[PDB]
């Protein structure tokens, strides 16, 4: 899997991990996608997940849009709303579901309102995984890429959502960072917050 675990701690009944690698290789029953509002997986982690699941990113975009329409009766999601799709080709590595979430557009800015939207984008998939009886879930750094939220602020917000979460089914939560320099930043956040 070419995955490195950098930090592990108990946060309630949840075992929380910080890992460095590709989220499409992480051993979790559900992986979270940092999607856009329309689930058009043309770039970033959304493209990576879409290409890994369906073999073609455009194909997974069609499957994701159909799932959004059936679950919400709309062609877009808001912060906190979560679309569930089958992980298809990723089922061979233990990943059964993709939980699509949408974070805010920071563009290098930070505020209480941007924090609330991101907090909802992290808590929503935890609550959806809980509702489904999913025991393990992996997250990317939602809004830290194209949406331009400061990585340190993204990791602090992710930790708030994990700490506030209440559940009986979710036992393992992981934050998966692709870049090694970015993983080091996330590590320092975990160390002073836990
Ligand atoms: N395979 C990977 N595994 C783990 N993390 C990854 C991977 N590839 C990238 N990342 C990291 O994943 C993090 C999130 O970066 P982004 O995927 O851009 O997500 P967003 O929430 O900012 O933008 C969402 C969409 O909205 C926009 O309008 C675009 O349409 C976007 O597709 C970064 O730190 C990446 O380095």
Measured from the Cα of 23, ligand 1's closest atom is 3
Looking at ligand 1, which residue's alpha carbon is closest to its atom 14? 145
Which is nearest to 130 in space by CA: 175, 88, 82?
82
**Cβ–Cβ < 8 Å for 79, 58:** no
Long-range contacts of 82-85 (CB under 8 A, 24+ apart): 82/124, 82/125, 82/127, 82/128, 83/35, 83/39, 84/128, 84/132, 85/53, 85/60
**Which residue ranges make up each domain of the chain?**
1-194
Pocket test residue of 100, 121, 147 for ligand 1, highest count of atoms within 8 A of CB: 147
Mutate to test the pocket of ligand 1, among 61, 95, 140, 150 (most ligand atoms within 8 A of CB): 140
Q: How far is CA 122 from CA 16, 51, 160, in A?
A: 14, 23, 9
Token readout for 129 is: 């995984």
Q: Which long-range contacts (CB under 8 A, 24 or more apart) does 21-24 make?
A: 21/176, 21/178, 22/48, 22/176, 22/178, 23/48, 23/49, 23/138, 23/139, 23/140, 23/176, 23/178, 24/48, 24/49, 24/52, 24/53, 24/90, 24/95
Our measurement of the distance from residue 76's CA atom to the centroid of its chain's CA atoms, rounded to an integer in Å, reads 18
Is residue 117 within 8 Å of residue 104, measured between CB atoms?
yes
Residue located via tokens 């043309």? 42
Experimental method: X-ray
Q: Which residues line the pocket of ligand 1, CB cutoff 6 A? A: 22-24, 34-36, 43-46, 48, 103, 140-147, 176, 178-179
* CATH class in words for 1-194: alpha beta
To one decimal, the resolution in angstroms is 1.8
Q: Backbone dihedral region of 88: left (phi > 0), alpha (psi from -120 to 50 degrees) or beta?
A: left
- CB of 90 closer than 8 Å to CB of 1: no
Closest of 85, 79, 18, 78 to residue 49, by C-alpha: 85
DSSP state of 89: G
The secondary structure of residue 122, as a DSSP letter, is H
Separation between Cα atoms, residue 184 and residue 172, nearest integer Å: 21
């Amino acid at each position: 899997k070419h995955m490195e675990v950098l930090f592990e701690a108990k946060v309630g009944d949840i075992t929380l991990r910080l890992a460095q690698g590709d989220i499409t290789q992480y051993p979790a029953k559900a992986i979270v996608n940092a999607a856009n509002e329309r689930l058009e997986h043309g770039g970033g982690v959304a493209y990576a997940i879409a290409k890994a699941c369906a073999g073609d990113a455009g194909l997974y975009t069609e499957i994701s849009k159909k799932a959004m329409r059936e679950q919400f009766g709309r062609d877009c999601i808001d912060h906190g709303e979560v679309v569930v799709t089958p992980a298809m080709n990723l089922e061979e590595r233990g990943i059964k579901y993709v939980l699509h979430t949408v974070g805010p557009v920071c563009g290098g800015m930070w505020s209480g309102e941007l924090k609330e939207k991101l907090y909802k984008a992290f808590l929503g998939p935890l609550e959806k995984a809980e509702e489904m009886g999913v025991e393990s879930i992996a997250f990317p750094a939602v809004s830290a890429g194209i949406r331009g939220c400061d990585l340190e602020k993204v990791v602090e917000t992710f930790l708030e959502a994990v700490k506030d979460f209440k559940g009986s089914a979710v036992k393992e939560v992981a934050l998966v960072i692709y870049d090694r320099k970015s993983a080091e930043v996330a590590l320092k956040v975990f160390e002073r917050s836990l």
